[PDB]
Structure 1
Amino acid sequence: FYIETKLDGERMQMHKDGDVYKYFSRNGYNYTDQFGASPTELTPFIHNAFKADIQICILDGEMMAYNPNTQTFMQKDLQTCYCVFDVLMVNNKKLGHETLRKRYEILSSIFTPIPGRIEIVQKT
């Protein structure tokens, strides 16, 4: 059977171009100083799980913190995790025309998750 879970966190966006990435808030703001602009530097980690020909990408999501030993998201110290529910542009291709159906499905195409640091979720 199945259990569903309503969660919320800090809405952020990620831009990706070939090892150089940027971090934008809801309002927009540069949070690249919190997470990081390259793999050497709060989520270097995520850097390599990406499919091949993906080089440039935009991904909408919301930023969560989880507890490793408890394997759950604390929503009431720990580690930062990005739960990504959408994609806008990737590999030159900005498709906002496609239904969110299509963009979520496509999301499987972009990456592969690390659990507890960057999973994937539904906006529903």
Structure 2
Amino acid sequence: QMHKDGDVYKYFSRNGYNYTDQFGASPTEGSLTPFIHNAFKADIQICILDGEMMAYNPNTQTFMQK
């Protein structure tokens, strides 16, 4: 689950453990936020999303199971 507050990101796992370090808290650092920041709209300052994280291989252009 990802919480976006302006320029602040907070990633939490299924059990509530803080994963923001791995995925990043700000666009300047991380593995997902620096690249997915541009995908958000201008009129979205507060947002909460719940989803799944996978490993996308671009050579096959497909997701790889755990």
On whether the aligned pair clears a TM of 0.5, the verdict is yes
Does the Cα contact within 8 Å between 2:4 and 2:47 map onto a contact in 1? yes
Distance 1:23 1:68 in 2: 24
Give me the CA root mean square deviation. 1.2
Between the aligned partners of 1:28 and 1:44, the Cα distance in structure 2 is 22
Tell me which stretches of 4 or more aligned residues in structure 1 moved more than 6 Å: none
Picking from 35, 47, 50, the partner of 2:40 is 50
Structure with the higher fraction of residues in strand conformation: 1
> Separation in 2 of the partners of 1:43 and 1:17?
12
Q: What is the TM-score normalised by the length of structure 1?
A: 0.49
State the TM-score, normalizing by the size of structure 2. 0.89
Query: Per-residue CA shift, 1:52-109, capped at 9, x if unaligned?
Result: 1100100000101110111000116xxxxxxxxxxxxxxxxxxxxxxxxxxxxxxxxx
Give the match's secondary structure for 2:36.
helix
Say how many residue pairs are matched: 64
2:36 and 2:49 map into 1 onto residues whose CA distance is 13
Q: Which has the higher contact order (CA 8 A, sep 6+)?
A: 2
Give the greater-gyration-radius structure (CA).
Answer: 1
Contact 2:9 2:26 in 1 (8 A): yes
- Provide the C-alpha distance between the structure 1 equivalents of 2:42 and 2:51, rounded to a whole number of angstroms: 21
Gaps of 5+ in 2: none
Give 3-state SS (helix, strand or coil) of 1:33's partner.
helix
Distance in 2 (CA, whole Å) between partners of 1:25 and 1:74 is 20
